[PDB]
Design a protein around this ligand. Structure first.
Ligand code: HEC
Ligand code: HEC
Ligand code: HEC
Ligand code: HEC
Ligand SMILES: [Ca+2]
Ligand SMILES: [Ca+2]
Ligand code: NA
Ligand code: NA
Ligand code: NA
Lengths: 376, 355, 125, 376, 125, 354
C-alpha cells in the first residue's frame, strides 16, 4: 500500500534525524533484468521523442533516453546494451538531416557509439518495432529504407560503422535469423529470405505465398528471435504462425484468436502492438474488442490468451482501460504490459490472472511501443 | 449546319488534293486505323513523318488527333503558366489556326500558297456545293476566305464524337459498367499517388467531366535528341528544338525546351513516344521518369539502346520539382502503370493492343 | 465519441475528425495551423507523395479519392489531431498506408511532419 | 455563430459542386496588422518549442514558427519582420550547443537571416520578453547574457552578423531607447543607461535608486518603446513609471494598482505577464487576485484597469478563466489578450467591457508569452 | 488544490508538489525520472550552481536551506512537474530566483533542463 | 585526568626549552594573540616562518591551530578521496603524530633527536611531577616514551574548548542569538550557492553539528609559486611542492599538487593566504577563484602585483570541475563574501578585525 514517494519521504526523514550524509551524484540504473520494460513515445510525430526505462516489478521509472524524429528502439535480448536509429535536423525540424545510430550502456545510459548513416536512409513511419532489428549475436543492426525503394541498411555495431545498403524486392519488415540472414514480408504474399555479405548481391529466396491478397497482415507482428517464431495476426484475429528456427520458413497451422460467434458479433483485434508472444509458455496474447472493421488502430479493452500449438483459448481478460499496445516479460510468472496512448500510462498486469498490479503514468505525449528483453 | 460543317471536314481530311503532288492527305500521317498517327516507316522509323515530296522528314513525332478537341485555346493563366494551343510547342492558338499550317509547309503537304489550295478546292464540284452552302457563293474564289473555311471545316470535324468517343475501359469503369483487374487498379492508384497526376490530369483537384490525362501545361522533362530523326530532318547538328520558346510572341527564356503535356489517351497504340519519337516502347517512356528518382545504375540506361539516356537537348528549365519525387518505380509498378495506360485505349483500337 | 464505433462522415465542419474527406487522415488538419483544407501553412513545404483513400461524401452520395499530402519541414502542429483508417491497409500496400510520413518530394528535402491536407484527386473506382 | 470550420466546409462543398479548381500550395499569412497576436510556448522547459501567429480579430491561427530551448521572441513594431534568439543542440538536448538569431518574413514566415551567436552566449531562463530586444530602428537585436557575468550582446540585423558583447554592471533586462542606447535595471535599485558606439567600452550611467531593497519588482514589466514608457509593478501592485522618451530617465509619480483595503484583504498581482500598457489610451492593465504573498506566479482571475497619469481605477474585470499572461492590441477599441498556461488557450476580450469574445485553444504545452506589434 | 492559497508543506510524499523541501522548486522532481530526492537520473549531468530557499519542515519545526540543483543534458522529464515560490525573488536577486536554468558547472557543458533535486545544505538565517 | 593532560600540554606549548637554542616554542609561530599563527616579519613577509636558528625559513605558511582538533585522522574514503590528517600535505596522521615533527625539524625547533627533547624535559621538576603523575615514574628517562607523551599532551591541549570555542558571529546567528546584516546574509547565501561549499563545508548535504568550513579533502587549485618565500626557504628554484604526493605511502600521481582544504574559521585574521602565503589580502584570495570563471582581462591579474597571477606550480590534477563553475563573482559579491568570512572570526579575535 505504501507508495514509492511515501517510502522515500520516510527514508529521507530518518536520514535527516540520524544525520546521515550522502553525496549528490548521477545514479546508475539497476542491472537489466527480465522485468525491465522500455516504453517509447513517438509523441504523435513530434520532432523530438522520449524513451522511458521502467522497472516493471516496482512500477518505477529508472531512466530515460532522448530521441529525434520517429526513432526505432531495439533492446539486446541478453541485456548487454540498448540502441536506437534516430533522426535530427539542424534547425529543429527544418534544415540538414542527420540519421544516426546510438548504442547505450544499459545502466549508465551513456552513448557508447554514435554511428552516422549516410544519405539520410531511415524509413520515417509511425514506429514499428520490426523495421529496425538486431542480429541474434547483437553485432549487427539492420534498418529499413523505403525511399527511393525498399532497402535494408547494415550497421556494424561491433566496429561502430555503417556498412552498406542492400537492394531488396518489394518487401517489408526485418526478422533476423542469423548473423547474415533475415526475413521480410512481401507484397506478393510470400516471405523473402535475405542472406547477405559485405559486398555482392545478397541471396534472396522467396517462400511460397501463405495468405490471400485480401487478408491483411498487421504492421505489428510479434517475433521471438530465440524461438524463431513469427506470430502474425490479420485484421480478423486469424493468426499466421511461421517457424523460422531451422533457418528456413515452416508454415504452422493458422489459429483464430476469436470464435465464430465473437466474429459474428463484431469482435476484432485493434490498437498498435496488438500481439504479444511468450516463448517459454508458447502463448499468444491479442488485444481485441467489439469494433467496426476499419477501426483497427483504436484502443482495445480486452486481451485474449491462447495456446500457440492448439489455438485453444486459455483466458479473456477485461483490462479496465483503453489499451493500445501489449507485450510480456519473458520470465516465469510473466507480467502483461498494457500501454495506453490516451492515458499516457503503462498498466502492469499479472499475465496469469489478468489482474492490474500497478501503473506508471506521465509517459510523454503519445507512448505506443513496449519493448522487453528475452534474457532467459 | 453543325453536322454539315463537320461532314465537309470529313471529306477534306482524307483528300490528297490538298498536297502539292496529290500524294498526301491529313489521314496519311494522321491515320484513323492507328489512332490518327503515322504508321509509315521513314529514314528514322516511325519517329518522324515524311512529307508530300517523298523525301522531306519533319523533326517532331506525329501526334494523335484523338481528344485534341478538348484542349483550351492557347493562353497564360494567373499562375504565369502557359496552357493550351496545338503542336508540341503550342505555336497554334487552336485547331482552326493549326489546320492551315500543314497545307503550306514544304516538309509536309507543300502547297506553295493559299491561292493554290483555293484552286484545288474550286476544281471539285462537291466542294463548290459543300463550301458555298455553309459559307456563301464565291467563297472558293477568295483564297483567304477558302483557306479559312477549309480550316474551319477541319476543326469542326475533329470536334466530333468520332475523335473523342470516351469509350475506353477506363471510361466504362468510371461509369460503373465494369471493373478494373487488380493490376489495372494498382496502376490507377499509382498514377494518382505518384508524380504522374501532377501533369497528366486535367485538374489540380476535383474531378474532370471529360478527363484526357493532360493539364495542357508546358514542361521540359529533359529528353535527349533523337539522333536518327534529327539527321533525317536535316536541321543540323547544331540545331536546338526550343519547344514553347519557338512560338512567335514568347520571349521568356524560361520557356525553352518545354513541350505541351500530351493526352495519355490511346498512348498504348501511338508509339514511338515523346515529341521526337525517341522511345519505341511504352515501358521505356515510363522508365525514363525513374532516371530522376532511382539510385540504381540501370536507371541511367535507356533499355532500348543499352546506352545512357543522353544529355538533355535543353539542359535548363527542367521540371525538377515534379520529376524529383523521391520514390522509384519498381518493375511491379511499371507493369501496373502499363496496364492502367492500356485501359485508356478507345474501344475501336482495343484489337491493336495485341500487336 | 465511441472510438470503436463505425465512423460516420459529415460535410459541415472541416476542423472535426468526422469530416468526410478525413476518412483516412493520420496526424493533424492543416486548416488548424494556418493552412486550409487543401493548402499548407506558411513556412512549411508541400509534399508531392501521398497516401490515398476512397472517402464517401454524404453531401452527394459519391465516393472520391482523397490524396492525403503532407505539409513538411515543421514540428507537428498539435492542433486538431485526428486518426482515421477507412480502407487503410498495412505498410506492404503503401498507397493505402497512413503511418508513413508522406513527405517525399517536398522542397528542400523536408521530411518532418506538420499537418496533412485533404484534396480530391479523382472519383473512386 | 458559423465557425471557421463550418464556413470552410461550405466553401469547399461549393467549389466541388461548381467544378472550381485551385492549386494545392503554400499559403501566405495575411499582412501584419494591429490585431495580429503572437503566443510563445516555452513548453515547460522542453528542448524544442513553438510560436503561434494568430489573427486576434478572427481568433484564427495563421502561422507557426519552430524554436529551440527557451527562445526569446521579438516583433518589430512597424510589422516589417519578426525574430527570435534560439538554442539548439546536436543530439536533442545533449552535445554541441548552437545559439543563433533568426529573422523571418512576417507573411511567408521564411527565415531571411540565420545569425550564429559565438560561445553560446544566451541567457537560458523562463521567458522574459525584455531579455532580448530590438532597437527602435530594428537594425539591431540586443540579447542578455547572465553567464559568466551580466553582459549584453549586439547583433547587427542589417549586416546579418554578430558584433560584440558589452560588459555591464550587475543589472538585468534590456530597454532600448535609441539606435545606440538601452536601459537596464540593476540590483542596487537604480537604472543603468548604456550607450554603445561602433567600438570601445560602452558609456554607462546610473540613475538614483528608485526603490528600496525590500520592494520586489516583477520579471515581466511592460515597455512601450514608441512611448519610452517603462511600467514596472511590484509584488504588492505598486507601479513604478519611468519616462525614457527624452533619452534620459525621468521618474513619474508612483501609483497603486490596488487600494489599501484590497491589499489588507490579500489582493496581490500574480501570474507571468501580469501587466499590460496601452500607449494611445495611456492605460495600465494588471492581473490581480486574492492570494498568499508567495503565490506570485499562480494564475489570476481578475484584471484591473487604471489611468497611468492619475492612477484612478477605470475598471475591474472578472476574467472567467485562470489567466497567467495579459497584453493588449495597440489600436483603438483595443483587444485584451488573456493567456491561460493551464488551458493552453488564448482568450480574447474587449478591453473596454472586459467581455470574452473568442478563444484559440490547443496552443502547445505551456504557453506563456503574448507579443503584439505597435503599428500606429 | 487552490493554487492561490498559502502553501501547506507535508513530510510524507516526495513526489507531491507540497513536499516541504520543494518550497521553491521550479520544474520536475528527479525522483520521478530515475533519480532520487537528492540524486540525478542516469545519463544526465549534475549542475554545481543553485537557486536557494529556506523551507519550513513541519515535522521538526526547523527551517532548512534547500539548494536546488538541476540535472542537465536531457529534455525535460515531463513527470511530477511542480512550481512553488516560497521566498522566491525576481531575477535581479538570482540567488533566490527560480525561473533561471541552474545548469552552470554541469559536466559536458550541459545546459538543458531535465529535473531538480532538493538537498538540505544547511539551517536557515 | 583529561584536564591534567591538557594542562601539561598548555605548559609544553609556550616552552622554548623544546627548541635547540631555546628561542622558540609552539606559541612563537602559533601565536594565541593572532589565532595561533605567526605575526613575525621575515625575508618573505608573513608568508613563511623563521625557525629556532634565526636564519632558516620554511616553504609553507603557518596555519591556525584553531579547530584543527575537529579534523579526522588521515584516510582514503569509499570514493577514493583522501581525507583528514594534519599539515598542508597531510603527511601526519593526526595531532599526536604531528606534534613531534616541528621539535625535530632543523628548519623549525631543531632539536637533534628525541633523546635531546627528553633531556630538556628531565631538567624541569614540574615536568617530572606532571609527566610521571600521568604516564608513570621514569617516563622522562626513556626518550621514546617521553617524546610520545609530550606529543600526547600537546594533542590533548589542542582538543580543549579554547582552541575551538564556536563563539563566532556565525555560531551565534545559527543559535538564533542574533542576525546577519544584509551584506553578511548575502555573503552566506553566495557561499552556499556558489562553488565554495563544494569544498569549504563539512558535509555534501545536511547540517553539520560543529561546522569548520572544510570537507578535509585534498585539492589542487592551481596556485603559482610564492617567489620570495621559495627564495627564503632555501629549497632551490628547481624545487616543486608536490603537496599530498609528498606523504609517505602516497604514490598515486593524481595526488600531485593537491593540498588540504583549510578551515575558514578565523580566516579574516590569519593572512597571508594559501599553503605558501602568496596572497596578503583576503579579497585577493577570493578573487583568485575568478581566474577560472571570469572572461574580464582584470581576472588574469593579481591586484597585489598588477601582473598575471602566474602559471601553476603543478600543472595537473587541478580541480577544474569544481573551479570552472561558469559564474564570475562581481565586486559586490566579493564584498559580500569578505563580510561573511569575517563572521567566522572567534569572539576573542573580533578586536583584531581592525
Ligand atoms: C507529313 C505528315 C502530316 C500531315 C500530312 C499532317 N500532319 Fe498534322 N501533325 C504532324 C506532325 C509531325 C505534328 C507535330 C508537329 C509539331 O509539333 O510541330 C502534327 C500536329 C497536328 C496537330 C496538333 C495536335 C497536338 O496535340 O498538338 C493537329 C490538330 C494536326 N496536326 C492536324 C492536321 C490536319 C487537320 C491535317 C490536314 C490538313 C494535318 N494535320 C496534316 C504530321 C502531319
Ligand atoms: C512535370 C510534368 C510531368 C510529370 C510529373 C510526368 N509527365 Fe509524362 N509527360 C510530360 C510531358 C511534358 C511529356 C511530353 C515530353 C516531350 O515529348 O517533350 C510527357 C510524356 C509522357 C508519355 C509519352 C506520351 C506520348 O504521347 O508521347 C507517357 C507515356 C508519359 N508521359 C507518362 C507518365 C507517367 C506514367 C508518369 C508518372 C511516372 C509521368 N508521365 C510523369 C509531363 C509529365
Ligand atoms: C617555525 C615556526 C613553527 C613552530 C615553532 C611550530 N610550528 Fe606548527 N606549523 C608551522 C608551519 C610552517 C606549518 C605548515 C607546515 C606544512 O604543512 O608543511 C605548521 C603546521 C602545524 C599543524 C597542522 C595544522 C593544519 O591545519 O594542517 C599543527 C597541528 C601544528 N603545526 C602544531 C604545532 C605544535 C604542537 C608545535 C610545538 C611542538 C608547533 N606546531 C611548532 C610553523 C611552526
Ligand atoms: C576545489 C575545492 C574548492 C573550491 C570550489 C573553493 N576552494 Fe577555497 N580552498 C581550497 C583549497 C584546497 C585551499 C588551499 C589552497 C592551497 O593553499 O593550496 C583553499 C584556500 C582558500 C582560502 C585561504 C584560506 C587560508 O587559510 O589560507 C580562502 C579564503 C578560500 N579558499 C575561500 C574560498 C571561497 C570564498 C570560495 C568560493 C568562491 C572557494 N574558496 C572555493 C578548496 C576550494
Ligand atoms: Ca507517338
Ligand atoms: Ca595564513
Ligand atoms: Na532513333
Ligand atoms: Na611573495
Ligand atoms: Na609519496
Amino acid at each position: 500500500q505504501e507508495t514509492q514517494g511515501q517510502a522515500a519521504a520516510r527514508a529521507a526523514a530518518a536520514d535527516l534525524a540520524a544525520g546521515q550524509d550522502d553525496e549528490p551524484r548521477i545514479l546508475e540504473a539497476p542491472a537489466p533484468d527480465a522485468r525491465r520494460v522500455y516504453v517509447n513515445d513517438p509523441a504523435h510525430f513530434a520532432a523530438v521523442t522520449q524513451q522511458f526505462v521502467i522497472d516493471g516489478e516496482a512500477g518505477r521509472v529508472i531512466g530515460m533516453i532522448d530521441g529525434g524524429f520517429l526513432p526505432n528502439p531495439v533492446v539486446a535480448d541478453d541485456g548487454s546494451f540498448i540502441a536506437h536509429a534516430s533522426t535530427v535536423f539542424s534547425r529543429i525540424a527544418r534544415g540538414e538531416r542527420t540519421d544516426y545510430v546510438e548504442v547505450f550502456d544499459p545502466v549508465t545510459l551513456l552513448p557508447t557509439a554514435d554511428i552516422e548513416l549516410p544519405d539520410a536512409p531511415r524509413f520515417l513511419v509511425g514506429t514499428y518495432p520490426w523495421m529496425t532489428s538486431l542480429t541474434p549475436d547483437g553485432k549487427t543492426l539492420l534498418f529499413y529504407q523505403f525511399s527511393p525503394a525498399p532497402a535494408v541498411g547494415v550497421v556494424d555495431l561491433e566496429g561502430k560503422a555503417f556498412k552498406r545498403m542492400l537492394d531488396v524486392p518489394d518487401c517489408y519488415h526485418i526478422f533476423p535469423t542469423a548473423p547474415d540472414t533475415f526475413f521480410m514480408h512481401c507484397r506478393d504474399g510470400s516471405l523473402a529470405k535475405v542472406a547477405f555479405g559485405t559486398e555482392g548481391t545478397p541471396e534472396i529466396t522467396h517462400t511460397e505465398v501463405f495468405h490471400p491478397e485480401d487478408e491483411f497482415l498487421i504492421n505489428h507482428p510479434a517475433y521471438s528471435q530465440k524461438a524463431g517464431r513469427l506470430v502474425w495476426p490479420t485484421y480478423t484475429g486469424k493468426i499466421h504462425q511461421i517457424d523460422l528456427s531451422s533457418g528456413d520458413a515452416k508454415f504452422l497451422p493458422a489459429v483464430e484468436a476469436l470464435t465464430e460467434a465473437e466474429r459474428a458479433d463484431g469482435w476484432r483485434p485493434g490498437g498498435w502492438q496488438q500481439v504479444a508472444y511468450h516463448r517459454a509458455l508458447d502463448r499468444i496474447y491479442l488485444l481485441v474488442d467489439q469494433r467496426d472493421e476499419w477501426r483497427h488502430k483504436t484502443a482495445s479493452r480486452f486481451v485474449v490468451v491462447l495456446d500457440a500449438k492448439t489455438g485453444e483459448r486459455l483466458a479473456k481478460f477485461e483490462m479496465g482501460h483503453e489499451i493500445d499496445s501489449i507485450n510480456v516479460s519473458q520470465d516465469e510468472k510473466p507480467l502483461l504490459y498494457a500501454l495506453s496512448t490516451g492515458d499516457k500510462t503503462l498498466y502492469i498486469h499479472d499475465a496469469e490472472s489478468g489482474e492490474e498490479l500497478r501503473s506508471v503514468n506521465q509517459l510523454g505525449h503519445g507512448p505506443q511501443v513496449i519493448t522487453t528483453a528475452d534474457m532467459g | 449546319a453543325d453536322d454539315a460543317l463537320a461532314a465537309l471536314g470529313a471529306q477534306l481530311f482524307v483528300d490528297p488534293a490538298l498536297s502539292r503532288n496529290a500524294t498526301q492527305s491529313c489521314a496519311t500521317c494522321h491515320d484513323p486505323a492507328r489512332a490518327f498517327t503515322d504508321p509509315r516507316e521513314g529514314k528514322a522509323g516511325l519517329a518522324v513523318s515524311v512529307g508530300d515530296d517523298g523525301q522531306s522528314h519533319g523533326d517532331r513525332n506525329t501526334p494523335t488527333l484523338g481528344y485534341a478537341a478538348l484542349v483550351p485555346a492557347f493562353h497564360r493563366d494567373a499562375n504565369g503558366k502557359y496552357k493550351g494551343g496545338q503542336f508540341w510547342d503550342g505555336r497554334a492558338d487552336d485547331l482552326k489556326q493549326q489546320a492551315g499550317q500543314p497545307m503550306l509547309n514544304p516538309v509536309e503537304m507543300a502547297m506553295p500558297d493559299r491561292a493554290a489550295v483555293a484552286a484545288r478546292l474550286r476544281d471539285d464540284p462537291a466542294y463548290r456545293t459543300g463550301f458555298e452552302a455553309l459559307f456563301g457563293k464565291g467563297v472558293l474564289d477568295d483564297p483567304e476566305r477558302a483557306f479559312d473555311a477549309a480550316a474551319e471545316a477541319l476543326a469542326a470535324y475533329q470536334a466530333t464524337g468520332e475523335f473523342s468517343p470516351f469509350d475506353s475501359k477506363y471510361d466504362r469503369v468510371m461509369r460503373g459498367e465494369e471493373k478494373f483487374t487488380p493490376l489495372e487498379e494498382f496502376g490507377y492508384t499509382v498514377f494518382i499517388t505518384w508524380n504522374c497526376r501532377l501533369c497528366h490530369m486535367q485538374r489540380k483537384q476535383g474531378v474532370a467531366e471529360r478527363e484526357t490525362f493532360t493539364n495542357f501545361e508546358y514542361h521540359n522533362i529533359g529528353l535527349p535528341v533523337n539522333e536518327t530523326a534529327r539527321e533525317a530532318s536535316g536541321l543540323g547538328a547544331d540545331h536546338v528544338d526550343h519547344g514553347l520558346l519557338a512560338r512567335p510572341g514568347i520571349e521568356d527564356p524560361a520557356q525553352s525546351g518545354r513541350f505541351k503535356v500530351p493526352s495519355l489517351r490511346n498512348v498504348a497504340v501511338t508509339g514511338p513516344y515523346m515529341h521526337n519519337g525517341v522511345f519505341t516502347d511504352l515501358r521505356t517512356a515510363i522508365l525514363f521518369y525513374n532516371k530522376y528518382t532511382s539510385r540504381r545504375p540501370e536507371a541511367k540506361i535507356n533499355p532500348e539502346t543499352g546506352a545512357p539516356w543522353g544529355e538533355p537537348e535543353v539542359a535548363r528549365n527542367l521540371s525538377l520539382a515534379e520529376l524529383q519525387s523521391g520514390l522509384m518505380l519498381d518493375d511491379g509498378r511499371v507493369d501496373a502503370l502499363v496496364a492502367f495506360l492500356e485501359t485508356l485505349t478507345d474501344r475501336r483500337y482495343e484489337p491493336l493492343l495485341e500487336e | 465519441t465511441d472510438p470503436r464505433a463505425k465512423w460516420v462522415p459529415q460535410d459541415n465542419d472541416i476542423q472535426a475528425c468526422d469530416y468526410w474527406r478525413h476518412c483516412s487522415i493520420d496526424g493533424n488538419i492543416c486548416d488548424c495551423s494556418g493552412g486550409s483544407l487543401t493548402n499548407c501553412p506558411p513556412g512549411t513545404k508541400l509534399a508531392t507523395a501521398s497516401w490515398v483513400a476512397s472517402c464517401y461524401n454524404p453531401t452527394d452520395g459519391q465516393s472520391y479519392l482523397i490524396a492525403y499530402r503532407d505539409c513538411c519541414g515543421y514540428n507537428v502542429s498539435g492542433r486538431c489531431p485526428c486518426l482515421n483508417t477507412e480502407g487503410e491497409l498495412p505498410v506492404y500496400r503503401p498507397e493505402f498506408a497512413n503511418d508513413i510520413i508522406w513527405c517525399f518530394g517536398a522542397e528542400d528535402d523536408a521530411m518532418t511532419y506538420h499537418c496533412t491536407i485533404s484534396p480530391i484527386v479523382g472519383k473512386a473506382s
